[PDB]
């Protein structure tokens, strides 16, 4: 068969709402694994300066203490069934994931129902996990692209709830007690901001009967009718530059505010971002690589790596490029990156956009190949897009994108805009912000 018939033959996600409003979705396929996870809409957003590390602390803390199965009885039960867990926490999503066999499904959803509602919070575990969180946050300074992405989120959205980290600062970790964490659990872990993603190996009527038995009546009504509210965060085009000249490699990111999740143009900004592409120095393509920024970078030995990202949040996104470069070619990488960006934005070709559309189609089906990242897509799509967009509709959104369409909405979201610039390392040969802005908008057009 063909591509459109094959992505039609990819099975649908039945999404259903329980008696409290919690959303349940599954993707039944042929494999015998089973990847049930709860996605909660809490994150670093919907946190103030107080209780800032509460989402990362509860992500760390939901496995260690339980009301019904106390101590390490969660670990003993999940290794009696032999399963694997995961807990990633982002700026707008926190999640709990179990990959298992499909014959352990009431044990998996019972362990999730004891994780997300009946988690106990012992103060000895609070002190021990506070020490482990402080040691991990000291270890996280080596994670330099995470440092630069956190600096970019600090300098891109200053004065907003998106300025703060997911982990929280060290002056805010040390004052987090139990009652602030259970206030965060009573506020932001509410049931219709929670989805139950399954992927293959399951049956949806079995999952809805088990969600009626276990994950029903979590919490629906607020305490004093005090609803949380999302705000449109201000994007401030700024520059932060952490200068460490003894450090070997400079990580510099440049990002413009993109439209975000609910706006329909993430496909065309992603196909511009995928025309620009990515490079690391272990890639054996050489000079003959298709992306001309990577071809120029390996032609004149500019940088070690560059990665072009479209990180999206609800109405606010960061789309840009982060490069690991040396101390002597940041001006070259910034000039050739803005030249490739606005060569794309002025002179986009049909061969370039069909290369990008093909690499986006392959990147989306390679992302949604595996059961754990397709559950990541099910949870993120159910919390953000409302419905879950199937890949036939993603193909129909991809196939309408042409070079003219890309040129004007690139002129909307790229041209003459003030970007946010972050840098950790030897940031001396970064240009100053007026040279970044003069290297944005073109001398010809």
């Amino acid at each position: 068969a063909t591509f459109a018939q094959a992505l039609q033959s990819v099975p649908e996600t039945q999404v259903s709402i329980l008696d409290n409003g919690l959303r349940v979705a599954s993707e039944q396929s042929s494999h015998a694994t089973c990847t049930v996870g709860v996605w909660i809409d809490a994150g670093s957003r919907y946190e103030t300066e107080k209780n800032n590390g509460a989402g990362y602390f509860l992500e760390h803390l939901a496995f260690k203490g339980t009301k019904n199965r106390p101590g390490n009885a969660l670990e003993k039960e999940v290794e009696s069934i032999g399963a694997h867990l995961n807990a990633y926490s982002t700026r707008e999503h926190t999640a709990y994931l179990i990959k298992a066999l499909s014959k352990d499904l009431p044990k998996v959803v019972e362990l999730l129902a004891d994780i997300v509602q009946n988690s106990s919070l012992e103060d000895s575990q609070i002190e021990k996990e506070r020490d482990v969180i402080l040691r991990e946050m000291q270890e996280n300074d080596a994670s330099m692209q995470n440092v630069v992405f956190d600096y970019l989120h600090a300098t891109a959205f200053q004065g907003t709830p998106l300025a703060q980290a997911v982990e929280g600062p060290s002056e805010n970790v040390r004052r987090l007690s139990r009652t602030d964490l259970t206030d965060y659990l009573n506020r932001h872990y509410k049931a219709p901001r929670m989805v139950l993603a399954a992927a293959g190996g399951v049956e949806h009527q079995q999952l809805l009967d088990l969600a009626q038995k276990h994950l029903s009546s979590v919490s629906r009504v607020y305490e004093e009718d005090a609803v949380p509210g999302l705000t449109p965060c201000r994007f401030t085009g700024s520059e932060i530059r952490h200068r460490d000249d003894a450090l070997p490699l400079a990580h510099v990111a440049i990002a413009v505010e993109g439209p975000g999740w609910a706006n329909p143009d993430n496909v065309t900004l992603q196909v511009a971002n995928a025309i620009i592409g990515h490079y690391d120095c272990t890639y054996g393509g050489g000079v003959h690589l298709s992306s001309p920024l990577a071809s120029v970078a390996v032609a004149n030995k500019l940088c070690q790596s560059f990665q072009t990202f479209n990180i999206s949040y609800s109405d606010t996104g960061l789309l840009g490029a982060h490069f690991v470069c040396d101390a002597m070619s940041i001006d070259d990488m910034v000039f050739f990156l803005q030249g490739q960006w606005m060569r794309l934005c002025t002179s986009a070709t049909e061969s370039e956009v069909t290369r990008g559309k093909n690499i986006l189609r392959n990147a989306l089906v390679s992302h949604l190949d595996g059961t754990t990242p397709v559950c990541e897509d099910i949870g993120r799509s159910l919390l953000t897009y409302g419905r879950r967009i199937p890949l036939a509709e993603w193909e129909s959104r991809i196939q309408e994108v042409d070079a003219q369409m890309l040129r004007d909405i690139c002129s909307k979201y790229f041209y003459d805009q003030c970007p946010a610039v972050a840098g950790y390392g030897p940031i001396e040969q970064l240009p100053d912000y007026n040279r970044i802005r003069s290297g944005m908008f073109w001398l010809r057009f």
Binding site: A1, T2, A32, N72, V132, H288, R355, N362
Partner: protein, 420 residues
């Protein structure tokens, strides 16, 4: 419906498997038995330069046409190399899988291997060795195999610095002539029809239809290396001889690995059923990571304990872990914990199955080494057929066999192999 994988054999000699999933992703993978144990001591690092030479020129397409064609279709061309096997793997869109198939079969069948391309590629060899030795696991895994084997499997996965600058295209051509041939080649396909893959394999794989140059039998060496690194995290691993993959002792040894903690099942947890982690954490309070790892090749295998510790308490960590495996060898075991190890191995094999690149690697290694595809339910029946006395016998075999230890870090309190 996804039909069962046909695992057929060509009269040329190649093992070809293909199924149609009516998939978004069509992945085609050619699997060669031409790894680091198959290269010799005179031509060392030839497997690393052949792994980096997947994007080079070939008899049928230039390297610019290769890279622009794979990027214009949108697929990826990546090769995964063990010490035993190499696996060229191209995934992409189902419409242009013919163009991906001709590019991959040109690259794997008839490379030109021109001298300026490999003279450019030796800088990429240095960069790939530096990136892969930024991780501390791969360095002592390579020196662990160097001290654990004598001649064949002791050849490193990455090219050493003495051969960097001396890898010749004539030696590359001699190794790809003597070890890329049809009777050791297995070509598997997910989302590609079997008659189409039969036609592409017969139209481009009539060349190089021999059995190949025979690899040497690996023998056990023993002894230590112990070397200094310069960090507080000391990585030390003690292994011994286990059976080859496809043997009942190796099926016992993998469930003894999952009894003694194959990895972090819980993110940011404590791993409170792994007996190695319990018997180390009852005596140590510093941060650590004690696992057991198994690696079974076609002739001989390694089973052992990998301990990452701080430099002060690493002697107590290694001796407490070795006394825990002594307790398993005398037989202090719980049958519910053995059943939990069996369920951990069955679930981890299903994690290996459930990804399509992992499923392609699974049937590529099965059709490459064994030549037959067992069902995963038959694998679950074999793991359920493994019982407690085989775990006791394999723990006695590991504690009574000759050991080999690779260590790296501040070594002032790291114990020796005679001190164990």
């Amino acid at each position: 419906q996804p039909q069962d994988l046909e695992f057929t054999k060509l009269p040329n000699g190649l093992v070809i498997a293909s199924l149609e999933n009516y998939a978004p992703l069509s992945r085609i993978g050619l699997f060669v038995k031409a790894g680091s144990r198959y290269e010799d001591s005179n031509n060392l690092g030839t497997s690393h330069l052949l792994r980096l030479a997947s994007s080079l020129t070939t008899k049928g397409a230039s390297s610019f046409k290769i890279t622009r064609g794979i990027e214009a279709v949108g697929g990826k061309l990546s090769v995964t190399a063990t010490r035993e096997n190499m696996a060229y793997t191209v995934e992409g869109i189902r419409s242009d899988i013919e163009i991906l198939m001709e590019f991959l079969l040109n690259v794997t069948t008839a490379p030109e291997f021109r001298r300026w391309e490999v003279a450019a590629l030796r800088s990429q060899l240095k960069i790939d060795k530096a990136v892969a030795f930024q991780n501390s696991q791969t360095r002592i895994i390579e020196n662990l195999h160097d001290v654990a084997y004598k001649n064949a499997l002791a050849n490193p996965l990455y090219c050493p610095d003495y051969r960097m600058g001396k890898i010749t295209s004539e030696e590359l051509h001699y190794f790809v002539q003597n070890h890329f041939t049809s009777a050791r080649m297995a070509l598997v396909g997910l989302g590609v029809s079997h008659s189409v893959l039969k036609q592409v394999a017969e139209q481009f794989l009539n060349m190089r239809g021999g059995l190949g140059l025979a690899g040497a039998k690996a023998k056990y060496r023993g002894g230590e290396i112990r070397e200094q690194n310069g960090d507080n995290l000391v990585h030390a691993a003690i292994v011994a001889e286990s059976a080859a993959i496809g043997n009942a002792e190796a099926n016992a040894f993998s469930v003894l690995q999952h009894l003694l903690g194959a990895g972090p099942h819980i993110k940011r947890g404590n791993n409170t059923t792994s007996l190695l982690s319990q018997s180390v954490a009852k005596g140590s309070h510093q941060p650590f990571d004690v696992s057991a790892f198994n690696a079974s090749y076609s002739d001989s295998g390694l089973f052992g304990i990998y301990t990452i510790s701080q430099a002060a308490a690493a002697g107590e960590v290694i001796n407490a872990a070795y006394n825990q495996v002594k307790a398993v060898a005398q037989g202090n075991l719980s049958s519910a914990d053995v059943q939990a190890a069996k369920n951990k191995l069955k679930a981890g094999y299903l994690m290996s199955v459930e990804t399509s690149e992992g499923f392609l690697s699974e049937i590529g290694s099965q059709a490459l080494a064994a030549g037959s595809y067992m069902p995963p339910s038959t694998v679950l029946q074999q793991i359920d057929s493994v019982a407690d006395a085989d775990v006791v016998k394999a723990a006695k075999k590991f504690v009574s066999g000759k050991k080999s230890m690779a260590a790296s870090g501040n070594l002032g309190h790291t114990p020796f192999l005679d001190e164990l």
